[PDB]
Design an enzyme around this catalytic site. Structure first.
Site, PDB file in Angstrom:
ATOM      1  CB  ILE A  15      24.703  50.963   9.681  1.00 15.83           C
ATOM      2  CG1 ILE A  15      24.689  52.441  10.072  1.00 15.83           C
ATOM      3  CG2 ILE A  15      23.287  50.379   9.608  1.00 15.83           C
ATOM      4  CD1 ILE A  15      24.162  53.330   8.966  1.00 15.83           C
ATOM      5  CB  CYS A  16      23.493  52.036  14.036  1.00 13.91           C
ATOM      6  SG  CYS A  16      23.125  53.276  15.172  1.00 13.91           S
ATOM      7  CB  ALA A  17      23.136  48.653  17.498  1.00 18.02           C
TER       8      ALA A  17
END
Ligand SMILES: [Cl-]
Ligand SMILES: [Cl-]
Ligand code: NA
Lengths: 199, 196
Positions: free
Chosen positions: B103-105
């Site tokens: 997830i995310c970065a």
């Protein structure tokens, strides 16, 4: 001075706790996690260790601008059983400071220990029956200005709750700036932007 | 047997993403192991929250788990990308036929930068969309690419959706719906959980 006290206990809901702390830190607040008991680390409801920086007995309300209480059933019960925690609720409220609580805590702490008597509040739906029916809110996030009280429902409202805290303490503009990177559901973001106007 | 999930953590990992993942998976009855990159079991998250791992990442083997879940956080994702052990472990999970989730970065700073899941559709945080080849970028909140058993998602505000999708994929939509039921998701966050 944008200082928040976040008590934690054995059984505190760890995602609620960490959402609160992280979101407030993103907003530039100085957040102190303080443990109920005499161990600085406490095990959350789902096993995650929460490492506090001081003990709840070392806390005094004049060092903070607001008090934020996580939920979790065991954690809320630990709060209800803590002389020091109950005293801090009294101290913050009698200094006119925001007290914020989520999930089981408004039911198992406030309703059970006669805190915020007469206030509108919400809590986790599985505990709605603990709140006087005429005072129960079913809002995901409920602010009751008369007693400077913010309450909310559960893990899935924790981000909305923490962002509402920012809006109340530091203004909706900062809350909006903190919210944007967090990839809220569009409905969550809209309701944050309208939160202060709704007061 | 209860599903076993490995959740690596590092200095600078996004602690709310991490803890949302761990808590939600534990709610499903899964056995979740947090494992630290580096030589300390406790690592400080991006916003200062200490994350206490149970064991070192570098000694983990994919054989001991059913799925890998990678939190974001810019510093944490950079630490992941700089860890030979972590990178080899991603490939071990995939080549064992197992779900890899991030997830995310992390899909940008680990998968795109270190050339993992070439050819896969994926999402990531909007501020890293430019790291993903345009023909493979999903702007979905949660993106599953079944061919490579790859689940990706965007940010703190999608982490609950992401973890619930992991439950659905690993153990069925019924369990995912049961776990979600009491958590007070926004009703609209629960509309697509139906179809993982
Ligand atoms: Cl970050
Ligand atoms: Cl819940
Ligand atoms: Na390690």
């Amino acid at each position: 001075s944008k200082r928040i006290l976040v008590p934690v206990a054995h059984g505190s809901e760890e995602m609620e706790t960490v959402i609160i702390v992280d979101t407030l830190v993103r907003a530039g607040f100085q957040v102190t996690m303080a443990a109920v008991g005499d161990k600085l680390q406490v095990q959350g409801s789902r096993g995650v260790w929460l490492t506090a920086e001081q003990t709840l007995e070392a806390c005094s309300a004049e060092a903070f601008d607001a008090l934020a209480l996580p939920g979790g059933v065991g954690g809320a019960q630990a709060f209800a059983d803590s002389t020091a925690l109950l005293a801090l609720i009294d101290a913050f409220s009698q200094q006119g400071k925001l007290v914020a609580a989520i999930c089981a805590t408004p039911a198992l702490v406030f309703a059970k220990q006669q805190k915020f008597v007469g206030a509108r509040m919400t809590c986790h739906p599985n505990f709605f029956d603990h709140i006087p029916s005429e005072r129960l809110s079913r809002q995901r996030v409920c602010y009751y200005a008369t007693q400077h009280l913010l309450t909310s429902q559960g893990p899935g409202t924790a981000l909305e709750f923490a962002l509402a805290m920012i809006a109340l303490l530091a203004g909706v503009e900062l809350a909006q700036h903190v919210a944007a990177p967090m990839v809220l559901h569009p409905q969550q973001l809209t309701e944050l932007s309208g939160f202060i106007d709704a007061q």
